Design a protein around this ligand. Structure first.
Ligand SMILES: CC(C)CCC[C@@H](C)[C@H]1CC[C@H]2[C@@H]3CC=C4C[C@@H](O)CC[C@]4(C)[C@H]3CC[C@]12C
Ligand SMILES: Cc1cc(C(F)(F)F)nc(Nc2ccccc2-c2nnn[nH]2)n1
Lengths: 280, 232, 338, 50, 224
């Protein structure tokens, strides 16, 4: 049963690589085409194309890691490539997840309606707030690299594998920004529902749900698989390929979530299909 | 426009004293302020400068570290905190307002000053003339010299002319070369090129008797010159 | 008697048209068909001026050709140093709906006005360090569209009550009221000898006035829409118009009719601001399609395009020495071109 | 309409020169001041700030 | 760079800081434009939120500051200064429900209602107000209730063929104002009926501008 499961996960990772590369290349390519042909872009577009570049780099890194794993595994089995690949992955992934958290911070600051003084101070300086959030949270990256490298050094000192500790450390470090993003999302939903209830008691005569329904569906669909990833590893064969599949799910499908929910990317995807239908 | 200073008196050597200047009649927050010394048998010496917004503080080399200059814009008060006073700080301390934009008139108004007594490189401005005899209705030329050429790349020569009447605060006559100050009668004129400078009075009266001082504003610490006296 | 007066008016109009067509013997395009073309004049944004928070509606240069005043709907009247990109002054306005601004030839005063029906004169050279309102001129029923300084004591204003007025700033009262326009008067321009001025209005007409006499000398009706901009030639014997029919037109005072029309078929937008160069060869017109165009005045051919503005350019001027053009647009940006 | 016919009578009685003379005067002013125009003939590095 | 040029640059930086903090202080204010006919109840609304030219009315409600602008003193051509109000948050339009017959000061016009619909066509379909929302106050509803029984609504619109009750005729008037903009997706028209004695109109304007602010933030986030 191991071989068929491995082959299934190999096909799943190939599909994930194709989907993530196509979606993030589409986002970056649409934003670059709009940047070239005049057509000045907003700061949400800048954060989205930064996310697209970061996720292209991440999915190319993990697919190259799988390629090194399959073809010529003698260089894949070396500790030096293990340490370099883990450090490169956490350097890429910290930026790739905190940029999405900064995008969620941008959405929460720009959209939600609060009368706090600190909220208005952050709301007047939203670009400065997301930039300072990117620079300040590098201490999380430094401490994550420190703990990962200490774990690798202790694993190779004890041996002279133990990837469960690496998985637990990276999953703890991946859920610190996830809690912030979920808190901001729930606060924005609560503010929108409170405003909708306010718009039914004072005034009767008078909000795109297509953006928010897919986002709620993605938080529901990803949090069950990321929790099932705990069961096989922490609480306890195809661990490397399964972990590479699970590490290529957020940057692959969250780009497709971000496409359906932005007006420009949805319009470009519609134009694209029009052109596909017109070409045939 | 009024600038009244407070403080002064006999201060023992090694002690501390604070000089406060009260400003009334103009926008104090939009003016940079100076402190200018004058020893009883010497000329004018520059002490410190604070800019609008208190973002640029400058001191002379003699008073660096010992002296601190500060302002309180809501109270319209300028302070000069002096510590470790020697016997070379016995002077009358003037407070000068200065505003800096294109076409502005720096060092336009000078305060009355408070006398301080204690018991017990730099662009050298040279005025070789001293105490020349004058006759009313004649023409008097006062010459000024500089070690460094004051003509900047922007076409401005930063040479300032001042008049010290007997028992009075200095007044500004010419701020940049051939730029007559407000209120100065249109008989004073200025000319020069680079190092050499001139100040020409067309038909002098009894009110033009005094000591005429040079000043450069090309770079800090704003060296003056030993003034030329006009005596009847 | 109304029919007799109407017949007399029609007869006088026919006589004026016949006298204008009698002088027309050769067009300006025919007589300037042998002079060499100017070429491919290309300018670049040497300086950009940032600091405004709303649409810039008017700007004016100084006689010193270095200081620049600007007006915008954020209630600010910023005096710029064009050489170093410095802010000499930032004058808050009582009314934020400003539509015009002027800079005095002596450099001691600036003016502003708009929907508050008041021309405000601001004193820049004061013993105190601030800029204060020297006088608030009131008396126009309609919105103030243009103001220009004759000297330190006289200012001429154009308003939306179909009248132009000449003021005395010390007395704060009307001196001469210019009447005869049917629509809203939109722009003014003053002759270099400071004795005549031309006013373009929304009745598709431009009228030449006398300052010392207060009467309309000549009336120029060639357009088909609202005249928004006006400027004399440097000679003082000609002037150029700009209207919403996508057409600039050049008129001569002595010939009393139109001489050359400036229109391309690819331009369908209004014209906000028209100015000449120092020699008068190079006419510059700011349009509503977010860029300025450069026209050869002696032969109606487009010799350049000044394209650097996101929103529509609303005001442009040339310095008195001719070394710079400053275009101001609705994207809160002033740009100096050379 | 008395003011209108008075203004039309005052506008008609004016000495009007030929159009060719006015066009030639504009040509003469352009030819005389062509050298002293920096927008037409650009100045080489004589722009002091730019 | 000279000492004087350095101090001038510092002065320019101070001016920039003052402009930026003024922008920060004025970012929380909401700019509104009031438009209407002559006797359309404009005076009953300005009194309800609290050669001359503009009239600026300032009022606050729950951490929002409003600046209404009245342009009734400008009797010149409206197309030459309406671009000044291109960045306003909302347009308050006041129309009278008591305009069944109500001939104008000219005394040959058909109705004040037809002039009100003409002004609504001029404003809602304008080039500078393509995405600017409208708050629509149908005031003088007391005279409307005391006038619907005496005179049928067919004296104004010869297409009604319905009952002359208060609710049906008022809804017909409101719907005839509403089905008049051909940009129904972008801008929204908020409607209310005011009896000139209500005390909840300020809450209506506050709720409407909260809607407009949230929709503008959603729009420039790219969400729609
Ligand atoms: C959202 C989270 C929990 C998904 C799982 C992410 C982490 C735990 C995954 C994603 C990429 C993975 C790495 C991908 C490739 C290799 C190569 C080989 O030497 C085995 C370990 C190593 C270095 C993996 C370790 C586990 C890893 C870092
Ligand atoms: C397409 C779309 C629409 C909406 C909205 F309709 F609710 F406004 N919200 C989101 N997202 C977020 C909002 C706040 C915080 C975090 C996220 C986030 N970012 N990534 N995943 N969730 N997205």
């Amino acid at each position: 049963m191991g071989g068929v499961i491995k082959s299934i996960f190999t096909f799943v990772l190939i599909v994930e690589f194709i989907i993530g590369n196509l979606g993030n290349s589409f986002i970056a390519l649409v934003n670059c085409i709009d940047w070239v042909k005049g057509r000045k872009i907003s700061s949400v577009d800048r954060i989205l194309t930064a996310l697209a570049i970061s996720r292209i780099s991440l999915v190319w890194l993990i697919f190259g890691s799988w390629c090194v794993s399959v073809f010529f595994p003698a260089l894949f089995a070396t500790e030096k490539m293990f340490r370099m690949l883990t450090n490169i992955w956490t350097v890429i992934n910290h930026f790739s997840v905190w940029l999405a958290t900064g995008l969620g911070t941008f959405y929460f600051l720009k959209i939600a309606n609060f009368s706090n003084s600190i909220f208005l101070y952050l709301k007047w300086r939203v670009k400065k707030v997301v930039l300072v959030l990117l620079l300040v949270t590098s201490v999380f990256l430094f401490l994550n690299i420190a703990l990962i490298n200490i774990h690798i050094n202790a694993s190779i000192n004890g041996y002279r594998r133990f990837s469960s500790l690496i998985v637990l450390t990276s999953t703890v470090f991946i859920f610190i920004p996830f809690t912030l993003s979920l808190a901001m999302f729930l606060l924005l939903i609560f503010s929108m529902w409170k405003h909708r209830k306010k718009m039914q008691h004072t005034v009767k005569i008078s909000r795109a749900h297509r953006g928010v329904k897919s986002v709620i569906t993605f938080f529901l669909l990803y949090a069950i698989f990321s929790l099932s990833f705990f069961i096989s590893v922490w609480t306890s064969e195809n661990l490397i390929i399964l972990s590479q599949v699970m590490g290529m799910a957020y940057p692959s499908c969250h780009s497709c979530v971000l496409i359906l929910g932005n007006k420009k990317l949805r319009q470009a995807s519609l134009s694209v299909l029009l052109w596909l239908r017109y070409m045939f | 426009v009024q600038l009244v200073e407070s403080g002064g008196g006999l201060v023992q050597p090694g002690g501390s004293r604070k000089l406060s200047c009260s400003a009334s009649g103009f926008a104090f927050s939009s003016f940079g302020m100076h402190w200018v010394r004058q020893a009883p048998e010497k000329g004018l010496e520059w002490v410190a400068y604070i800019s609008s917004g208190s973002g640029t503080i400058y001191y002379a080399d003699t008073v660096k570290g010992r002296f601190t200059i500060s302002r309180d814009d809501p109270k319209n008060t300028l302070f000069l905190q002096m510590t470790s006073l020697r016997s070379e700080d016995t002077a009358m301390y003037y407070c000068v307002r200065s505003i800096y934009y294109y076409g502005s008139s720096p060092f336009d108004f000078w305060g009355q000053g408070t006398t301080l007594t204690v018991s017990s490189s730099d662009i050298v401005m040279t005025q070789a003339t001293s105490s020349v005899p004058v006759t009313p209705g004649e023409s008097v030329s006062i010459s000024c010299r500089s070690s460094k050429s004051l003509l900047h790349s922007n076409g401005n020569t930063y040479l300032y002319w001042f008049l010290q009447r007997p028992g009075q605060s200095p007044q500004l006559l010419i701020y940049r070369m051939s730029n007559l100050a407000s209120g100065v009668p249109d008989r004073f004129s200025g000319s020069g090129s680079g190092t050499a400078f001139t100040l020409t009075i067309s038909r002098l009266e009894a009110e033009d008797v005094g000591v005429y001082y040079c000043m450069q504003h090309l770079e800090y610490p704003l060296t003056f010159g030993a003034g030329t006296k006009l005596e009847l | 008697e109304l029919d007799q007066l109407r017949q007399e008016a029609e007869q006088l109009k026919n006589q004026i048209r016949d006298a204008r067509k009698a002088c027309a013997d050769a067009t300006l395009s025919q007589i300037t068909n042998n002079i060499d073309p100017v070429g491919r004049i290309q300018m670049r944004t040497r300086r950009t001026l940032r600091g405004h928070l709303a649409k810039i509606y008017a700007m004016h240069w100084g006689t010193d050709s270095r200081l620049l005043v600007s007006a915008s709907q954020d209630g600010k009247l910023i005096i710029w140093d064009s050489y170093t990109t410095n802010k000499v002054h930032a004058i808050p306005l009582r009314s934020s709906w400003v539509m015009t601004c002027a800079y005095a030839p002596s450099g001691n005063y600036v003016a502003c006005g708009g929907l508050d029906n008041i021309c405000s004169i601001y004193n820049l050279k004061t013993r105190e360090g601030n800029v204060r309102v020297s006088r608030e001129l009131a008396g126009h029923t309609g919105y103030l569209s243009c103001c220009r300084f004759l000297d330190d004591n006289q200012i001429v204003t154009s308003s939306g009550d179909t009248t132009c007025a000449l003021w005395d700033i010390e007395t704060g009262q009307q001196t001469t009221t210019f009447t005869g326009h049917t629509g809203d008067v939109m722009s003014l321009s003053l002759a270099p000898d400071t004795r005549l001025f031309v006013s373009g209005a929304c009745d598709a007409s431009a009228k030449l006035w006398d300052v010392r006499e207060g009467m309309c000398r000549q009336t120029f009706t060639g357009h088909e829409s609202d005249i928004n901009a006006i400027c004399f030639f440097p000679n003082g014997n000609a002037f150029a118009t700009g209207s919403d029919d996508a057409t600039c037109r050049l008129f001569d005072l002595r010939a009393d009719q139109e001489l050359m029309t400036y229109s391309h078929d690819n331009i369908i937008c209004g014209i906000t601001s028209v100015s000449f160069s120092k020699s008068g060869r190079l006419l510059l017109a700011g349009y509503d399609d977010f860029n300025c165009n450069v026209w050869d005045a002696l032969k109606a051919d487009r010799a350049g395009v000044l394209a650097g503005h996101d929103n529509r350019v609303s005001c442009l001027g040339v310095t008195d020495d001719g070394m710079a053009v400053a275009t101001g647009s609705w994207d809160s940006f002033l740009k100096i071109w050379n | 309409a008395r003011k209108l016919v008075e203004q039309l009578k005052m506008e008609a009685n004016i000495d009007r020169i030929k159009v060719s003379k006015a066009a030639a005067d504009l040509m003469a002013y352009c030819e005389a001041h062509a050298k002293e125009d920096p927008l037409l003939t650009p100045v080489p590095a004589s722009e002091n700030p730019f | 760079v000279s000492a004087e040029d350095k101090a001038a640059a510092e002065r320019s930086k101070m001016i920039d800081k003052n402009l930026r903090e003024d922008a920060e202080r004025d970012a929380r204010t909401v700019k509104l434009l009031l438009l209407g006919a002559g006797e359309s109840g404009k005076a009953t609304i300005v009194k309800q939120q609290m050669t001359t030219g503009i009239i600026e009315t300032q009022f606050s409600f729950k951490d929002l500051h409003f600046r209404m602008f009245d342009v009734g003193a400008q009797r010149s051509e409206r197309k030459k200064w309406i671009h000044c109000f291109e960045g306003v948050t909302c347009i308050i339009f006041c129309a009278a429900l008591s305009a069944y017959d109500m001939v104008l000061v000219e005394d040959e016009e058909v109705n004040r209602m037809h002039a009100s619909l003409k002004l609504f066509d001029s404003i809602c379909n304008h080039k500078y107000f393509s995405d600017t929302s409208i708050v629509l106050f149908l005031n003088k509803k007391d005279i409307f209730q005391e006038k619907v029984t005496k005179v049928h609504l067919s004296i104004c619109f010869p297409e009604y063929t319905g009952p002359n009750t208060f609710e049906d005729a008022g809804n017909y008037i409101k719907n005839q104002f509403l089905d008049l903009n051909l940009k129904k997706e972008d801008k929204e028209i908020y409607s209310h009926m005011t009896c000139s004695t209500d005390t909840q109109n300020v809450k209506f304007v506050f709720d409407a501008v909260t809607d407009i602010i949230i929709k503008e933030n959603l729009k420039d986030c790219g969400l729609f």
